[PDB]
Write a protein that binds this ligand. Sequence first.
Ligand SMILES: Nc1[nH]c(=O)nc2c1ncn2[C@H]1C[C@H](O)[C@@H](COP(=O)(O)OP(=O)(O)OP(=O)(O)O)O1
Ligand code: NA
Ligand code: NA
Ligand code: NA
Length: 153
Amino acid sequence: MKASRLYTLVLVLQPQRVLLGMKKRAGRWNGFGGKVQEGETIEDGARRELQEESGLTVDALHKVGQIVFEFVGEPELMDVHVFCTDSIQGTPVESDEMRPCWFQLDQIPFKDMWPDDSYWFPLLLQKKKFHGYFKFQGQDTILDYTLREVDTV
Ligand SMILES: Nc1[nH]c(=O)nc2c1ncn2[C@H]1C[C@H](O)[C@@H](COP(=O)(O)OP(=O)(O)OP(=O)(O)O)O1
Ligand code: NA
Ligand code: NA
Ligand code: NA
């Protein structure tokens, strides 16, 4: 059995568009998030990372999924808690590491996203909740995965 490290992932999903961030320093679009820190709830860590990485604040988030990632050659699992919100305060801000961009929901840039997103982001769009697991060789190749719609995350 492996140890896991906690991470967050936040999708700013509006009725016609989604906000993603491009990793600059790279080339992949993703939600916003990072490692949960000592002492904070997972939801508060998600809000903190959204603000640190995009400039956006939100009063609250909705938890929509949990995904565990395993990478060949890495002993630690990434336990990613996935949140959405439709309600935002301020404008997204580009940094040296991340460039935010809105995409229309008929132009979701799946080929330039993590490959797993093609499987779970459709569920998120349908207001479904999910649990997933994906094993990767490097950045591009999935060797094994499981995905399940759930009623409670
Ligand atoms: N396969 C995958 N699919 C996906 O959609 N998001 C993934 C993913 N693998 C990792 N992520 C997300 C999870 C989390 O939001 C982020 C990884 O966290 P980071 O290493 O960026 O955390 P930190 O911001 O704490 O790190 P530093 O900025 O290096 O301190 O990438
Ligand atoms: Na971060
Ligand atoms: Na961080
Ligand atoms: Na991050």
